Design a protein around this nucleic acid. Structure first.
Length: 377
RNA sequence: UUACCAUCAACAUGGAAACUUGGCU
RNA sequence: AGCCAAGUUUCCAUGUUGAUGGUA
């Protein structure tokens, strides 16, 4: 087997799991850093009434093993239970006076998901927690669901649960992703994520709405310049190397990417002065079946695995190939929805989920202040 | 919408040939 | 005939709504 991904937490060190998702371990160990939950609220409907209160003391129980002294939340109950009820609940009784909110709803579809993601992530910056009352409605199963949910508020508030040791200090990782949706006139949204520390705990996310691909190059140069100045303000240094990912676009536009974006990725990024040429690397990432590499990272319990194809389309880093393969094993960072790892590296699904919320129906842009934390999860 | 999903049923795009009306030209 | 359409018929992969089992 390849060398694993050792994970470190506050006064603890945990090896990779036998099932390769370190689930049970993070169910019974600490956190690197966790924003304290002091003033927060849950809102419920009486159909889940007892399963409301059996939830909230749950949030006072599982977390001291995870190392997070969570306090009692605030009761909210309001009658109406539609998408417009979600809208008035998320545009009026929602403010930065609260930390972040927990919502239980009986059952719902993707449209109210778009409603909560639109009204939690655009105007008033507060990435609240939405959890349905269908998966917790049975006893002796709320254990793992509530523990994952507890991890999700402790991640999506500015806190940072896990990290991977990085030999490539003073170097960041950038994920750029494109959503392939033609329902809303083929808007073709783009999601950008950039890390703001060599430990990769903090990041920086952005998304703008545009159809065409001519001013797209200039605007993502401006966005990456914002990313580099943010990285310089957090880090007070300069990243020599830069790694840029893909999502799963096939060979129908790989030549188009290599002829258009790759020479433009070296075009006018030397604005910082003189002779500071940054080493760059762009890799194409495929799932279904500078060097190509297949990765086994996710362990499957049902069905056959899908090993992940990597095609480095551009490289100036000079990174060592053994360091490259160990990094590519570790390149599935974070992913605070799913503890452990997946097939594909982290910023691919990260900006893919970002593209999912903005390109479902969100014909707007997320806030700039919602970049340091990981709001979109 | 706790995430990850394994499969199925249906649907838009992308085609591949057959066939009908055919127009052509 | 060839091409051009109006197309349909099935397959036909990608994306994509539901559901069957689930790992917790």
């Amino acid at each position: 087997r390849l060398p694993p991904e050792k994970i470190l937490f506050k006064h603890s060190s945990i090896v990779a799991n036998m099932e390769a998702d370190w689930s049970r371990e993070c169910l019974k160990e600490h956190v690197i850093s966790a924003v304290s939950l002091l003033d927060w609220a849950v809102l419920f409907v009486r159909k889940d009434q007892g399963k409301a209160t059996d939830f909230v003391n749950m949030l006072s129980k599982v977390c001291p093993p995870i190392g997070m002294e969570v306090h009692e939340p605030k009761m909210v109950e309001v009658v109406n239970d539609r998408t417009e009820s979600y809208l008035r609940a998320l545009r009026e009784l929602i403010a930065p006076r609260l930390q972040m909110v927990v919502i239980v709803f009986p059952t719902s579809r993707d449209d109210r998901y778009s409603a909560v993601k639109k009204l939690c992530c655009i105007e008033s910056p507060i990435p609240s927690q939405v959890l349905i009352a269908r998966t917790i409605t049975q006893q002796q199963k709320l254990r793992s669901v509530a523990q994952k949910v507890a991890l999700q508020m402790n991640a999506k508030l500015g806190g940072e649960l896990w990290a991977v040791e990085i030999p490539l200090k003073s170097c960041m990782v950038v994920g750029i992703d494109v959503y392939h949706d033609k329902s809303y006139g083929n808007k073709s949204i783009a999601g950008f994520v950039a890390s703001t520390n060599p430990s990769f705990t903090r990041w920086y996310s952005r998304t703008a709405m545009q159809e065409q691909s001519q001013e797209l190059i200039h605007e993502l140069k401006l966005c990456m310049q914002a990313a580099l100045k943010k990285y310089n303000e957090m880090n007070q240094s300069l990243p020599e190397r830069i790694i840029v990912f893909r999502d799963g676009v096939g060979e129908g536009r790989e030549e188009y990417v290599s002829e258009f974006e790759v020479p433009q990725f070296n075009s006018c990024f030397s604005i910082f002065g003189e002779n500071y040429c940054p080493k760059l690397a762009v890799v194409v990432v495929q799932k279904r079946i500078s060097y190509d590499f297949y990765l086994v990272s996710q362990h499957v319990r049902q069905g056959t695995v899908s090993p992940t194809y990597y095609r480095v389309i551009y490289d100036k880093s000079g990174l060592k190939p053994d360091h490259l393969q160990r990094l590519t094993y570790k390149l599935t960072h974070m992913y605070y929805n799913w503890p452990g790892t997946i097939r594909t590296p982290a910023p691919c699904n990260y900006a893919h989920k970002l593209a999912f919320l903005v390109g479902k129906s969100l014909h707007r842009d997320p806030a700039h202040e919602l970049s340091d934390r990981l709001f979109f999860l």
